[PDB]
């Protein structure tokens, strides 16, 4: 998110791609798990697209 | 939405070109 | 960094000729839009927050 | 029956953490419960309410609580064959 | 180099400071407080054994204590607003969402989630699942933070702030951010009083930072709780407390005066200051202790007044200190304007001249000295003009002549009154047409607009907006109205959850983009509005009628308080837009045109 | 030895209030 | 706390005055 904020330009489109082979990034830890969930609902919000 | 461009949004996905197919 | 099968080429591998195929068609297609490349879970880090 | 009724209630002790997750807190405190687990809840069963509910006595039970499954249940059986 | 600060985690002060805070009795937050500082001095003693001239003290951590007394750093230039907006931004928020909504409408209770008026308790729910749980930032790093957020703000740098802002968010936990925005806002709400705090630290503390205004200087000296300092009086260039005066009984004066002549001088308006001259050096403090030398100028070679006043003083006089109150005078019309024109010196107490100390001479000496120490010049710098008086009668005529004259009040002196900085009356009063009863005019009228408390007054009306009606035609009511000025004191809590609860169903929300008809706003827009046929009338006691831009009547209430919402008079009976314009006009502004008769 | 040694962690008068229902069946 | 009384809290709830109750 900050890196896309850093960009000055008008942006059409926001998007984000995650490359990962881990289904279960955050099982050991809970609150890790529901702080990514609450950072990737306000990205939702914000505007930008999760892939 | 469905067949958008993953690459460039907003365009359709171009199909591959398929030169002569003969029926 | 693991390949299930042998002679495969591993997920990072995979990722990176994505990322590279994705950088190639952007430059032919449209090279005024922006890219960007970010690695999370490495040692070393590289950010403005200092994360 | 009571499978049914376990997942149901794990369903709702999801919702619960959810909720107590998402930053919340009850107006009141009496209204709390303990986390749901069906091995320490058949065990206690077992151990504390089985001898009552195991006495048949004369059958009243069975007919007073056990008729509606049992008629349904041999009409089940009656219609299969 | 070693610092204590650097070795203690901001987590250990944040939580020192929730555990006082959560006390309801003052020997707990007593017994905290004592057991932290007990701690912070054995770490002190530990830390430093073979080193001389240790400059570490607790300053780094007393001044996150008590914000409101940094003086050393300079204006963070955020507040609630602008610090919500900062966390919006940083944290990426949706503009529109319900978190960015209630961190900016933080007033608001239609959210109803839990405290509706503290700025800090929304921001730290809202930032509870944006955070860590254990912080990594020592209380050096966060002063080092806080100067270069000041800095910042001096040095017009908003990218560094917001960087460093950043960091601040991202290396600490949701208790953590919430102290340090309750610091930033400089509002504690720790409960517990600044004097019982320097108690704690030391026996004289609350006196030697007095006499110095510098928390580094009391914090550094006043180290060790054993030794402490001999004497403690006003030092050159080091701010003082000014003295105050405590309100006047109209016929106690003689009882207050231990039946002695006393000094009667006309009451300024102006800006309360002290300058204290070295030399060719100046040093210019506020009443608060803030410098203001770059206002009023160091040297002779710059400033708005050093320049010019400083032919004025005598050649032996190398060593001075001043207390007076600036005016602008005009030229024009040769006067002093209250709060072309050019900054004016009166000046009424000399604490010190030469290189011996006038605290604790008699006001006699000091007024002595003050009339030979330079020779006023009209219009840059003067004194103060005296009179001698023992009777009440002398009293009354002076106040008379004020009144008539369209001043502020008399202040009254006792000649053997010693300065005393921070005392609220030893012998110094003001008298006003305020405090006598009848003198003023009361404007009942009616109310059209409130606004949400903040504080303790979290979910209810602490202020409203009041408005004139204007002159109906005859046989009809009236339908308009005028904003006239706003009101939030004056009334008590019961009386204020009375009033609220009177017209909390009425309320109607205000939307800017569609104003009331009934009701015309100029610049200032209530955030709920209510109309005019269901109100009440409220009374109050204005001190004089100031010219406004912020407001359609144009002019504006100085010192507005409620006297009482009347009951018995009705919602039409409110003042007409004619009778404001008779009222202003009858003496020119102030509202005190009626003498005192007895 | 750091930061962590060195850091830890009848009178009145009784009042009543009658509540009276007047409901019909009362 | 058991036998308080109703009217006075604070204060053990006196037994009624019976008398001279001769026994069996
Ligand atoms: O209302 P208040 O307590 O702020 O008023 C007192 C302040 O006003 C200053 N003041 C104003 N006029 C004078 C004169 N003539 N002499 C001394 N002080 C004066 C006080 O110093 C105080 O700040």
């Avoid at chain 3, 590279?20 to 090279?31: A, T």
């Avoid at chain 4, 007919?63 to 089940?76: K, R, S």
């Avoid at chain 5, 030794?227 to 309100?247: C, E, H, N, Q």
């Avoid at chain 6, 009145?12 to 009658?18: A, E, H, P, Y």
């Amino acid at each position: 998110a900050n890196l896309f904020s850093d960009v000055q330009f008008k942006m059409s489109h926001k998007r984000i791609m995650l490359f990962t082979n881990e289904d279960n990034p955050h099982g050991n830890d809970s609150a890790k798990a529901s702080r990514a969930r609450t950072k990737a609902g306000d990205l939702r919000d914000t505007g930008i697209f999760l892939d | 939405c469905p067949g958008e461009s993953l690459i460039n949004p907003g365009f359709k996905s171009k199909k591959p070109a398929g030169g002569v197919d003969f029926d | 960094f693991e390949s299930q099968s042998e002679d495969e080429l591993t997920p990072f591998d995979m990722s990176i000729q994505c990322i590279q195929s994705v950088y190639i068609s952007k430059i032919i297609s449209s090279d005024r839009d922006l890219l960007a490349v970010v690695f999370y879970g490495t040692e070393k880090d590289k950010n403005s927050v200092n994360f | 029956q009571v499978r049914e009724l376990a997942t149901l209630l794990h369903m709702k002790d999801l919702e619960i953490q959810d909720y107590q997750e998402s930053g919340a807190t009850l107006i009141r405190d009496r209204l709390k419960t303990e986390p749901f687990e069906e091995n320490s809840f058949l065990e206690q069963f077992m151990i504390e309410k089985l001898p009552e509910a195991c006495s048949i006595g004369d059958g009243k039970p069975f007919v007073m609580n056990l008729q509606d499954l049992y008629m349904a249940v041999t009409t089940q059986e009656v219609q299969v064959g | 180099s070693q610092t204590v600060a650097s070795h203690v985690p901001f987590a250990d002060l944040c939580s020192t400071l929730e555990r006082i805070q959560k006390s309801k009795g003052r020997a707990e937050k007593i017994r905290h407080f004592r057991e932290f500082l007990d701690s912070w001095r054995k770490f002190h003693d530990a830390l430093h054994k073979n080193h001389k001239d240790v400059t570490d003290s607790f300053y780094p951590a007393m001044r996150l204590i008590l914000p409101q007394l940094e003086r050393e750093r300079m204006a963070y230039g955020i507040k609630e607003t602008m610090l919500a907006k900062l966390y919006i931004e940083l944290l990426n928020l949706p503009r529109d969402g319900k978190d960015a909504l209630k961190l900016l409408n933080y007033r608001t209770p239609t959210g109803t989630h839990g405290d509706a008026g503290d700025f800090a308790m929304i921001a730290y729910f809202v930032l509870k699942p944006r955070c860590l749980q254990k912080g990594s930032l020592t209380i050096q790093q966060v002063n080092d933070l806080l100067d270069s957020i000041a800095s910042n703000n001096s040095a017009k740098r908003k990218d560094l702030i917001k960087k460093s802002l950043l960091q601040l968010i991202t290396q600490s936990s949701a208790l953590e951010q919430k102290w340090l925005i309750r610091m930033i806002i400089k509002d504690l709400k720790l409960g517990v009083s600044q004097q019982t705090i320097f108690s704690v630290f030391h026996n004289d503390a609350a006196e030697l930072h007095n006499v110095t205004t510098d928390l580094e200087k009391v914090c550094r000296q006043l180290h060790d709780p054993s030794v402490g300092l001999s004497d403690i009086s006003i030092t050159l260039f080091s701010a003082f407390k000014p003295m105050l005066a405590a309100i006047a009984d109209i016929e106690h004066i003689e009882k207050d005066m231990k039946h002695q002549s006393f000094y009667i001088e006309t009451k300024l308006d102006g800006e309360r200051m002290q300058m204290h001259k070295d030399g060719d050096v100046y040093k210019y403090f506020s009443r608060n202790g803030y410098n203001y030398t770059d206002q009023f100028g160091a040297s002779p070679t710059e400033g708005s007044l050093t320049p010019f006043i400083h032919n004025a003083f005598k050649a032996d006089i190398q060593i001075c200190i001043l207390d007076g109150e600036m005016m602008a005078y005009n030229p024009n019309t040769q006067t002093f304007m209250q709060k072309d024109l050019q900054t004016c010196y009166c000046v009424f107490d000399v604490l010190m001249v030469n290189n011996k100390k006038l605290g604790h001479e008699t006001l006699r000496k000091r007024y002595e000295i003050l009339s030979s120490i330079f020779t006023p010049i009209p219009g840059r710098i003067e004194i103060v003009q005296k009179t001698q008086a023992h009777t009440k009668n002398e009293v009354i005529d002076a106040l008379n002549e004020a009144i008539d004259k369209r001043e502020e009040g008399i202040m009254v002196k006792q000649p053997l009154s010693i300065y005393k900085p921070d005392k609220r009356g030893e012998g110094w009063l003001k008298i006003k047409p305020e405090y006598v009863s009848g003198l003023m005019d009361e404007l009942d009228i009616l109310i059209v607009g409130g606004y949400w408390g903040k504080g303790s007054r979290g979910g209810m009306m602490s202020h409203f907006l009041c408005a004139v009606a204007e002159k109906p035609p005859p046989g009809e009511k009236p339908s308009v109205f005028h904003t006239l000025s706003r009101v939030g004191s004056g009334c008590t809590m019961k009386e204020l959850y009375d009033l609220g609860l009177k017209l909390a169903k009425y309320w109607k929300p205000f939307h800017r983009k569609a104003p009331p008809s009934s009701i015309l706003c100029g610049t200032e827009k209530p955030e709920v509005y209510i109309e005019p046929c269901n109100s009440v009338i409220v009374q109050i006691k204005a001190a004089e009628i100031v010219p406004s831009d912020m407001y359609k009547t144009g002019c504006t209430l100085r010192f507005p308080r409620i006297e009482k919402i009347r009951d018995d008079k009705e919602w039409h009976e409110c003042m007409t837009l004619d009778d404001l314009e008779q009222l202003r006009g009858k003496a020119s502004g102030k509202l005190a045109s009626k003498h005192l008769y007895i | 030895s750091g930061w962590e040694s060195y850091y830890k962690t009848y009178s009145g008068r009784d009042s009543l209030i009658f509540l009276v229902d007047a409901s019909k069946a009362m």
